[PDB]
C-alpha cells in the first residue's frame, strides 16, 4: 500500500522552497545555493509535475538583458529535458530594500510605478513559459504603526494596480489569470488583505472581477487561528479558488513553512477531503521550507514528504466518504437536510406555514441529538487507519 | 477639561450588556435581573442616545401575544419618558437549545424555517420601534468537527435565508437595512463568516447586495489577531459600515467584552481617529459586559467608562490631526503621495515612461527613510497628552 | 486490531465531564442532569477505572450533614457495585458567586478563610473515599484589570493557603498529595500560575515542596500556544507529574474541552509516546465536555472515543519506538549523543581540551545534517499506519 | 512637563538593537552596518547609561587574538570617552550555522563543548568590562519536530552547562550572576524554557541556584499571550529578577521588537508601576529593533522614544499611586485586605472558627461588589492624563 506520486498528481514546488538556504532572522544560511536547473531535475525525479518562480529566483536582480536571456534558455532546456511544466509565476516585490514600504501600496509614487513595471515584465515571461496563473503576494503592503498608512488610500492604490494589470493582460490578449495571496502579518506588523475573506471582498471591487481569484496558503490562515478548510470552501463557493499553497503550521506564531502534513494534521485531512470532493483541478503547490537543520538529503526527503502525506490523506478521505457506515452517519447527522433548500416553497408559503412557527414543537426539535461525535470518531478511525 | 456625553454623541447600549447577570461557563449569576425599563432610565441619565435589543431580551421566550403586547407597551413608555431611541435590533438565534446547531444553517430544515419566522416577527417589531438597522450574528452557525457541516451547503443556506429576509423587507416596503456581525469562534469551535472580510465577500453574492452591510466588533476581530482599524477601513472603503460594536479585548482568547478603551488602547485610538476622520454617522454602540466582580454601582460606572474613553480618544485624535507638526510629519512620510494616483497617465504612458523602470534609481529610492517612528512617537505623545 | 479499554488502563473521568448539561456563555442547557450513580455505572460499562469529583458535583451546595451523608452512601454503593475507584478529588472554588474574586486569593479575607474550610472538609471526604491525589485549580485566582490584584500579595496568600493545607494533611497523618492545575485564562482575564512552569516554580517556595506536584491539562497549555509534550517532560524531569488531564483543543481560543485525540492530533501522539516511555503510572484522566449538540448517546460515544484514541496512539507510539529503521534514524540524528554528558571529564579538562575550541572545525560540524525530516516522516508514517 | 533621560535613569541598549541592519526573513538589509564606537557615542548623547553586547557584535566571529584585542581597545576608549557602562553581556549561540540545532542542547556533543568554551571566553571579557549580569538566551535550544529532541535529556544537558558555568565563575572568584532569558518560539518551532515560569522552575534544580535569575522580555511573554506584569511579579516574588528587556509587541505573532511603549500600552503602564513600586534597581534595558523602513535618523528617534515612553509612564504611575482618590478606591476594592494574612492565628484556630464556615454568611459576602471597574477607570484617566 505505497504512495508514489506521478506528474498526473499535479504536485508543484516553488524554486524558492527547496532552494531556501536557511537564513532566518537570527541566523546565517546553512546550505549553499541551488542552481534552478538542478532543482528542476531533482524535483522531476521525485515525481513532481512542475515548478513555479518569482522573477528574482530565476533571474538575479539587476541582470542585463543578455544574462537574462541566458538564464531563461538554461531553464527552458531543463524543462524540455524533464517534461516539467510551470503553471504559476509571481513577482518578488518584497526582498529588495526599495520595497521596504510596499510595492503596489508604497507611500512613494515612483516606487509604485516601478513595482508595476517589474510585474508587467515578468507577466510577459510567465506567458512565454506557459503559466496559467499569476500570483501576487503583497508581503510588504502594510504597516507597523497606525499613522504610516491610510488604509482607504492604500486600497485605492491596490485596486489601481490590479486594474492596470488587468488592462495589460486584456490588451495583450493573454490567457492568464491573477490570484491574490493573503497573509495576516509577517514581514509587516499587519498586512493588507489579511485573509481569504478580505481578498475575496476586494476582488469584487475590481473593474474586471472575473480575472482575479485567490491563492490561499494553509499556514497563512492558521496564523490568524482560522479554519483553513472553511476558508477554502468559501473560496470554492464563490468560484475563486484559482490556486492553492500547501504547507504545515503549528498555531499562531511566525510562518513556519513546515512540510505539508506537519502542523495541524486533522485540518490537512479535511482540506484534502474538500479539494477532492469538490473536484479542484488546479495544481497542488507546496510553498514550504525544509528546516535549516537539514542538509541536501534532508531537503529532498522533506519535499518527498509533502507529496506522500497528501496521497495518504487522499486515500483516507476517499475511504471515509466511501464507507457505508459513514454514509449512514451523515444521514443520522442530517447532512442530507443541510443540502436541501430551506424554503423552495417561497416566502409567502413560509409565512403561512403554521408548522414553521405557531405549531412548531421547539422542545422536540431541541431534544434531537446531532450525533456529531460518533461521526467524528469515524473520521478519526479512518484517518488513523483503525477501522474495524 | 471634562468629557460628558450627550445624546448627540450617539452612544447606544444593548439591553443585554448592562443587563448581564454574570453567568459564565464556570459560574452562576452574581447580579439580579434588570427590568428593561430600569435600564432605559439609568442609561438615559448617563447621557446615552439609545438602546438595542434581541427579541428575547425584551419579550421572554414563549410569551403569549398578550404578554408580548404588555412588554412592548411598558418599553415604549420608557422610551417616550426619556427620549431614548432604538436604532438597531436583532434576533436571539443562539440561546435556546433548539439552535444548538445553528439557526439559518442548522442541519435540520425545520429549525431553519423556525429561525426565519422568529427573525421576521422581530423585524416587524424593530420597524415599529423605529430601528434603522437589523443585525444578524450567527453565533451558532458553525461547527466543532469537520464532517458535521458541509460549508458550501451551509453558505447556500445562509444566502437563502438572507435573500428571503431581503425579499420580505422589500415586499413590506420597510426602510431598514441588515448588518452581518462576524466572529471567528465562540460558542462554536469555528463560526461561518469569521471576519469582516468573509462577511463583505459573502454579501456580494446576495441577490440585493445594497441592503446588507457589516456590524464589526472590536473584540471579535482581535480574537483572530487582526488589526481592527484596518478591517474597519476596508468596510468603509466598500461603503458597508452600517453599524459598529465597541468593546475591549486583551488578545487571542475567549471574548472578554471589556468596556471600550480597555484592552488594546492604541487600537482604540486609531479606531476613533478613523471613524471621526471618515465621517461615520451611525451609532457608537457598546456590546460589552461589566465584569461579574461588580455590583450595580460597578455596572453603571463601567457603562459610563465606555463613553468617557471614546470622548477622551476623540479629543486626542483630533489634536493629533490638527497639529501642524504632525501635518508636516505626514508629508515627510509621504502620506500625501499615497493619496495620489499611481498612474493617472494611463497604462501606455506608464509602459513608455523610462523613469519608471529603465532609468529608475532603485538605490536612491531605497535609501529614503519613511520617518514612520517619529510620526508614531508624535501619535503616542498626543494620546498620552504629553505634547511639549 | 481493536482497542477495548479495561480498568487496568487506568482511564478516569470527572463526574462533571460526562455530566455537563451543555450550558455555555451564550446558551441554556441541552441535556438533563445526570445522577452521579448513573454516571458511575455507565462509565464502568465502558471500561473506565474510576471517577473524580469536585465536592459540589457530589453534594449539592448548601446540603445538610444529613443529606450529605445520604449522597455519599449512595455514591459509595455505586462504587462497591462496580469496582470503580476514586483516585482524585478536588474542590469547587469557582462556581458560587462568593468566589467571584477568587478563593485562596480573594481580596476579602473572610472569603479566603471560607475557601480553606471548604477545601479541608472535602480533603477528609477524599481520603475516606481512597483518593491519592487532591487537585487544586484556581480558576478564579486572577484578574481582568491591573490594579485589582497585587500579584506579590496574592502569591503570598496562595503560599499561605497551600502551606496550611500541607500542615493539615501532615497533622492528620493522611497519605494524600496535592497537584496544582495551571491555566492561563478563562474565566478570569489572566489567571495566577498560568502554565506548568509557573506552577513548578511556585511549588519550590512552599514549606514542604515534596507534598505538591502539578496536574497539567492538554488544552490549558495549548491556550498559551505552548508545546504540551515539552511541558510534561519538564514536569517529569522535576519529578512533579502527579496527575494529568487529557482533552483536545484547537489552538488559542476559549477552552474547548474536546475529547482526547481531537484538536492537535500529532501533539497527542507525542504526549502518549512520552507518558508510556517515561513509565507514568498515574491515572489517565479525561477532563472534557461532550459538545452540547449531543444527546446522551453522543455523550457516551464521546467518552468512549477518549479512551479509544489513547489506545490507538499508544499502539502507534510503541511501534514507532520498536521499529529498527526508526532506531537507526534516531542514531543518525544523534539522539544517542544528546543523552551523553557534555563534559563528564570536568571543567578543567574541558578548558584544556583544544578539540573543543582552538582546533574545533566549526565548518565541518555546521555542514552535518540533523536528518530530522526523515525521522519525522517515519513518525508520521507510523501515526497514520502507512509503514511499508 | 518634559521627559529627558539622564544616565541616572539606567537606560541601556544592546549594540545589536540600534545596530540592526534591517535584514528579515523576507528581505535584505536596508541600513549599513554601524561601528560599535559610533553607537556608544550616539547613545551617550541621547542620555543612555550603558550598552550591552553579544561577543559576536563586538568581535567579528573568527577574529585572531590580535584583531580581538584591537576591537576591545577601541570599544574601551569609547566607553572611557563617554562615561558609558556595560552592565550586561551575553553570548551569540544562535547565528552561526554550527548552532543550527542549539548550543548547550545540540544533539552533537562536540558542538555542546564548543558552546561552553565560546561562552566562558566571553564571560572573562564581560568581567573585564565590568558587567554584573551575564545573560543566556537559548534561541536555538528546541525543535520543529517531536522526535528530534528528547526534552528530558536536553534539560539534563542544559543543567550540566549552567552548572559548569557556575563552577567556573566560583573558581575564578568572579562577581557576576547569570540570567536566563526565556522565549516560547522563534527561531525554533518551540524553544526550551518557554516562559518566565519554566525558567524559574529550572533554576531551582541547578547546583547553586543563588547564582541564577531571569531576564524576561516584554515581547517574549506576550508571544504566549501571557500577562507580562504578572510574570514579572512572580519573578520579583521569588527574588529572581536580575535584569529585564523592554520592547513592544502586538499580540501573538513573530517577535516584532517594537520600541518600548508601542504594542500593549496598558501593559507597559502596569509594568512600570510594578518596577518602580517594587524598587527594582537593575538596568532598564531595551532589546528592540528600529523598523527597517527607517534611515539612521529614524533609528535614533526610535531609541529616544523608548526612554521617553518609560519616563512618561513612570510619571503617570506615580501620580496614580499618589492620588488620594485612588488610595481610597484601593481600600474600597480591599487591596489592603489582600496584603493581610489569611490565618496568622494558625490552623487550629481556623478550624475552630465558626465565622469561617458554619456561621459564615456566604450570600452577604457574595453580594459585595469589588468596585474594580471604577478603580480601573481611575487608572485609565491617569494614564491618559485626563484627571479632573
UniProtKB/Swiss-Prot annotation, chains A, B, C, D:
Chief subcellular location equals cytoplasm
- Record's protein name: Xylose isomerase
Single GO molecular function: xylose isomerase activity
Provide one Gene Ontology cellular component.
cytoplasm
| Annotated binding of Mg(2+) 1, by residue | 181, 217, 245, 287
- UniProt xrefs under Pfam families: AP_endonuc_2
Which organism was this protein described from?
Answer: Streptomyces rubiginosus
Cofactor: how bound: Binds 2 magnesium ions per subunit.
Amino acid at each position: 500500500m505505497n504512495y508514489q506520486p506521478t506528474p498526473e498528481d499535479r504536485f508543484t514546488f516553488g524554486l524558492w522552497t527547496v532552494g531556501w538556504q536557511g537564513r532566518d532572522p537570527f541566523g546565517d544560511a546553512t546550505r549553499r545555493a541551488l542552481d534552478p536547473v538542478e532543482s528542476v531535475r531533482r524535483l522531476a525525479e521525485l515525481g513532481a509535475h512542475g515548478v513555479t518562480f518569482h522573477d528574482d529566483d530565476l533571474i538575479p536582480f539587476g541582470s542585463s538583458d543578455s544574462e537574462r536571456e541566458e538564464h531563461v534558455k538554461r531553464f527552458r532546456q531543463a524543462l524540455d529535458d524533464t517534461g516539467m511544466k510551470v503553471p504559476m509565476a509571481t513577482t518578488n516585490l518584497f526582498t529588495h530594500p526599495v520595497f521596504k514600504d510596499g510595492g503596489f501600496t508604497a507611500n512613494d509614487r515612483d516606487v509604485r510605478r516601478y513595482a508595476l513595471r517589474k510585474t508587467i515584465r515578468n507577466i510577459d515571461l510567465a506567458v512565454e513559459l506557459g503559466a496559467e496563473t499569476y500570483v501576487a503576494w503583497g508581503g510588504r503592503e502594510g504597516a507597523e504603526s497606525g499613522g504610516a498608512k491610510d488604509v482607504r488610500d492604500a486600497l485605492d492604490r491596490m485596486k489601481e494596480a490590479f486594474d492596470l494589470l488587468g488592462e495589460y493582460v486584456t490588451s495583450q490578449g493573454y490567457d492568464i489569470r491573477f490570484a491574490i495571496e493573503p497573509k495576516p502579518n509577517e514581514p509587516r506588523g499587519d498586512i493588507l488583505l489579511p485573509t481569504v475573506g478580505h481578498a475575496l471582498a476586494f476582488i469584487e471591487r475590481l473593474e474586471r472581477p472575473e480575472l482575479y481569484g485567490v491563492n490561499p496558503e494553509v499556514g497563512h490562515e492558521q496564523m490568524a487561528g482560522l479554519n483553513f478548510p472553511h476558508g477554502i470552501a468559501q473560496a470554492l463557493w464563490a468560484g475563486k479558488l484559482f490556486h492553492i499553497d500547501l504547507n504545515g503550521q503549528n498555531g499562531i506564531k511566525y510562518d513556519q513553512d513546515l512540510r505539508f502534513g506537519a502542523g495541524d494534521l486533522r485540518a490537512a485531512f479535511w482540506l484534502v477531503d474538500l479539494l477532492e470532493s469538490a473536484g479542484y483541478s488546479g495544481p497542488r503547490h507546496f510553498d514550504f521550507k525544509p528546516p535549516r537543520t537539514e542538509d541536501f538529503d534532508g531537503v529532498w526527503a522533506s519535499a518527498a514528504g509533502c507529496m506522500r502525506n497528501y496521497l495518504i490523506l487522499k486515500e483516507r478521505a476517499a475511504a471515509f466518504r466511501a464507507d457505508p457506515e459513514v454514509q449512514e452517519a451523515l444521514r443520522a447527522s442530517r447532512l442530507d437536510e443541510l443540502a436541501r433548500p430551506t424554503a423552495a416553497d417561497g416566502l409567502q408559503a413560509l409565512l403561512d406555514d403554521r408548522s414553521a412557527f405557531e405549531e412548531f414543537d421547539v422542545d422536540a426539535a431541541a431534544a434531537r441529538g446531532m450525533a456529531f461525535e460518533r461521526l467524528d470518531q469515524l473520521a478519526m478511525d479512518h484517518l488513523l487507519g483503525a477501522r474495524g
